[PDB]
Write a protein that binds this ligand. Sequence first.
Ligand code: NAP
Ligand code: FID
Ligand code: CL
Length: 316
Amino acid sequence: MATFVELSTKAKMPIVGLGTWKSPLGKVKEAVKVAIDAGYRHIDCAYVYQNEHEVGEAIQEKIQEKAVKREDLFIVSKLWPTFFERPLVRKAFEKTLKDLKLSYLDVYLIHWPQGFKSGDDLFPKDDKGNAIGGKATFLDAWEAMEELVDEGLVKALGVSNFSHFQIEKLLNKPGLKYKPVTNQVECHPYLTQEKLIQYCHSKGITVTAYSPLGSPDRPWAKPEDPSLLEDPKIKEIAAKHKKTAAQVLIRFHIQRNVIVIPKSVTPARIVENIQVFDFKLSDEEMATILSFNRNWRACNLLQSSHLEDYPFNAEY
Ligand SMILES: NC(=O)c1ccc[n+]([C@@H]2O[C@H](COP(=O)([O-])OP(=O)(O)OC[C@H]3O[C@@H](n4cnc5c(N)ncnc54)[C@H](OP(=O)(O)O)[C@@H]3O)[C@@H](O)[C@H]2O)c1
Ligand SMILES: NC(=O)[C@@H]1C[C@]2(NC(=O)NC2=O)c2cc(F)ccc2O1
Ligand SMILES: [Cl-]
């Protein structure tokens, strides 16, 4: 019901998907079922979210119950930066694929460009609190991920939280086999990503907007932080369309041809968040919303700001 953004592979990626970060065990399975019933086909997952097995249970049940076919679903997961060494890329992917109970993934993303030390910890740190970097780089990881496409286990690869310099470094890699089909980055009216979107699109790379509602449930949210859902100017535009602020925040991306993945575990909101194909923001409304840019990020992975490929030191 969601319309599509065409990838460079000619595959069609549904323009609205369901986000699953912070969706707890015991709720995410029902959230995915409700989403599929409401017409969602794209689900955004990750190893680090530690809930992929319940997403997998939901998908498996909906398929068997004949509510949906696998070919019509678009499932994305991500390789966490502690798994950049070749044997670990395969191990991590295999765990993700097993948890999701799938025979293939539609897109597999590098979750962050900066590599972390391999071992048992997901966030390895020294005795100061800083993140310990890894031995392998995202270029090393990419080479192992390409093997997954060669073998038919993943349809396409992509990146997440990459700056244009990092995409350039990937596109320029000697022996490159597969180009990224998307860059999944934070995007919303307070972080409009104009230059990065322009860059990605110029290279035939789509953009997937994460935290489009401003991630109000992020653990580190502070009272004084900007709040998109409460922005009276967003609400003003919404009320005009008899829509919610959330629906305007989602529709904003659709009209820039940017894929968007709002997260909810509340059935009414899951349904609400995909009722976004029955109205249209005017050119004036789009320009007003675009003017709200504050260069504000909900997600910074601050503790990894000192690593070589920390992505947010670049302008874009
Ligand atoms: N690649 C990356 O590094 C990265 C980083 C961040 C996020 N992501 C992906 O992007 C997804 C979305 O981002 P996010 O989870 O950070 O935050 P988000 O989608 O911007 O916001 C989620 C929050 O908004 C609430 N909400 C959802 N729909 C609502 C509605 N219609 N009205 C009012 N409140 C609503 C949710 O509450 P309830 O759930 O309680 O309903 C939840 O607290 C993630 O789940 C993840 O899949 C990726
Ligand atoms: N601090 C950050 O920017 C990231 C954001 C992030 N959410 C996300 O979907 N991808 C992320 O890497 C995240 C997810 C986690 F499971 C744990 C921490 C965490 O922090
Ligand atoms: Cl991950």
